[PDB]
């Protein structure tokens, strides 16, 4: 749950 | 229709497996290149779920939700979407397509072959590009995820895109007033073989024999 | 509309758990009591099938590959639809009624929970009796089967069906012009509920400590 | 499918 997590912060 | 539009434009640019020349046709080198392109793919996918009206408007966590529930079914959608013009073969990318032999040399026969159960289906429907970019939207807002925060929000995310579908599906479909229904009754195969993937390449993950990167373990495991 | 008042009157009479009181409670006991509600269900089906307005014109082969590929999404959907009016709890009978605690105890935490997720939503839409028989129909024609031989008559079946959904919602729900697809959009958690207690059981029946009848197990096999 | 046979045969 954290790889993800950062991708989606992205915007 | 704007959301179908915007859905249009909003789809990610192709890509390439890039086999690797230094191994021979085995197994376990296919199995990589697939642990390999999806993970690739789903960091473009990633990207492309912000970009779908509204998605945005959730929280980091529903959104990791969602993703997490559907990103397979995403995958899968867009091999199926490849390969409608090819017969019994599946397009996994344009560097990188299979067919009997090739994926029951895999061990990928079964699943494989019901990839190319949707292919018939939508090949049969003649499903076209805007009905396709939809039906990923709907799929990924339709997810089913048991961890939602917010459901109500979540449900009006479903709502956009299914009005979207029934509009495009009203005004370019007019001669059949069920197309719409017949697309979103697709779902169900879709999200059969979703699972029966996950739960193979976690047979394959476990058993420890391929290689898999960071994005693709931490989804082949929530 | 014809088909879903035919539907209506071919809706079968309650059946019973009939769990031995004599016997003390334990998970075999559930267990068997549960696996014997579904032989006696499952001969019910079968009888309830034969009037579905053109499922009988399909051949033996048809009509058993069908069957044997929804049987699980039909009895969940009755499960679900008796429990519509409960709060966290399963009508399997009207005297076989399981609560948290209950479920534990036969070991059926997890299923049940997600059994409670369908009931959710449909308690959400306020699904009516004639959406729900309706919906049980499309389930077995939109069960998705592998060994059918003629295509065009399934598919020919899914339509009259999805056609006389169609017609309710728009006759008696003028206001949700989307519910007969929110109705669809639901048929992927009913798909992924039921493959999950078809796998489930597959196991109690290999672990040999439950008893089985013969069409069930026979269901089971398949 | 032999007992279903049998149920949706007859």
Redesign the interface.
């Known amino acids: 749950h954290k790889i993800l997590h950062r991708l989606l912060q992205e915007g | 229709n704007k959301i179908v539009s915007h859905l249009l434009v909003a789809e990610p640019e192709k890509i390439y497996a890039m086999p690797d020349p230094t191994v021979p046709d085995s197994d376990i080198k296919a199995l990589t290149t697939l642990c390999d392109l999806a993970d690739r793919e789903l960091?473009v996918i990633?990207?492309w779920a912000?970009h779908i009206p509204g998605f945005?408007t959730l929280s980091?966590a529903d959104?990791?939700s969602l993703?997490?529930s559907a990103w397979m079914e995403i995958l899968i959608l867009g091999v199926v979407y490849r390969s409608l013009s090819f017969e019994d073969e599946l397009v996994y990318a344009d560097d990188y397509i299979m067919d009997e032999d090739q994926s029951k040399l895999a061990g990928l026969l079964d699943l494989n072959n019901a990839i190319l159960?949707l292919v018939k289906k939508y090949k049969s429907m003649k499903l076209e590009k805007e009905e396709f970019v939809t039906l990923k939207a709907?799929a990924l807002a339709?997810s089913?995820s048991?961890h939602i925060e917010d459901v109500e929000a979540v449900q009006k995310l479903?709502?956009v895109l299914?009005?979207a579908?029934?509009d495009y599906e009203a005004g370019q479909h007019m001669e059949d007033?069920?197309r719409?229904?017949?697309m979103?009754?697709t779902?169900?195969?879709?999200?059969?073989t979703s699972?029966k993937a996950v739960q193979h390449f976690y047979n394959i993950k476990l058993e420890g024999k391929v290689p898999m990167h960071?994005?693709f373990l931490?989804?082949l495991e929530?």
């Open positions: 960091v990633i990207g912000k945005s980091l959104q990791m993703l997490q159960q709907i339709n089913d048991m479903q709502d299914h009005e579908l029934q007033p069920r719409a229904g017949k979103l009754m779902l169900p195969l879709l999200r059969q699972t960071k994005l931490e989804m929530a």
